[PDB]
A paper describes a structure:
The region within kleisin Scc1 of cohesin that binds Pds5 has been mapped previously (Chan et al., 2013), and we therefore synthesized a 23-amino-acid-long peptide from L. thermotolerans Scc1 (121–143) containing this region. Although binding was weak (Chan et al., 2013), molecular replacement and a difference Fourier map with data collected from co-crystals of LtPds5 containing the LtScc1 peptide revealed clear difference density. We could locate and model residues 125–141 of Scc1 in the density, using data from two SeMet single-wavelength anomalous diffraction (SAD) datasets from crystals with Scc1 peptides containing SeMet residues to confirm the sequence assignment (red and green densities). Molecular replacement with four fragments was required because Pds5 shows changes in conformation upon peptide binding. The hook opens and the entire structure bends such that the most N-terminal part (left, top) moves by up to 10 Å relative to the central part (superposition based on Cα atoms of residues 473 to 726). The nose becomes disordered in the co-crystals. In the Pds5:Scc1 complex structure, the Pds5 hook opens because the Scc1 peptide is wedged between the spine and the end of the hook, maintaining a closed-ring architecture (bottom). Acidic and hydrophobic residues that in the apo structure of Pds5 make the contact with the spine, D999, M1027 and Y1031, now interact with the Scc1 peptide. In the complex, Scc1 is in a mostly extended conformation, except toward its C terminus, which forms a more compact arrangement with helical turns. As is indicated in Figure 1D, Scc1 V138 sits in a deep pocket in Pds5, lined by Pds5 Y493 and other hydrophobic residues.
Sister chromatid cohesion is mediated by cohesin, whose Smc1, Smc3, and kleisin (Scc1) subunits form a ring structure that entraps sister DNAs. The ring is opened either by separase, which cleaves Scc1 during anaphase, or by a releasing activity involving Wapl, Scc3, and Pds5, which bind to Scc1 and open its interface with Smc3. We present crystal structures of Pds5 from the yeast L. thermotolerans in the presence and absence of the conserved Scc1 region that interacts with Pds5. Thus, Pds5 can be considered the gatekeeper of the cohesin ring.
Numbering used by the authors: 125 to 141
The structure:
Amino acid sequence: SQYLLQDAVTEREVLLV
């Protein structure tokens, strides 16, 4: 968990950022 990066975007905002 500490070595892995989680997410930080939803599913409606993926490549729209």
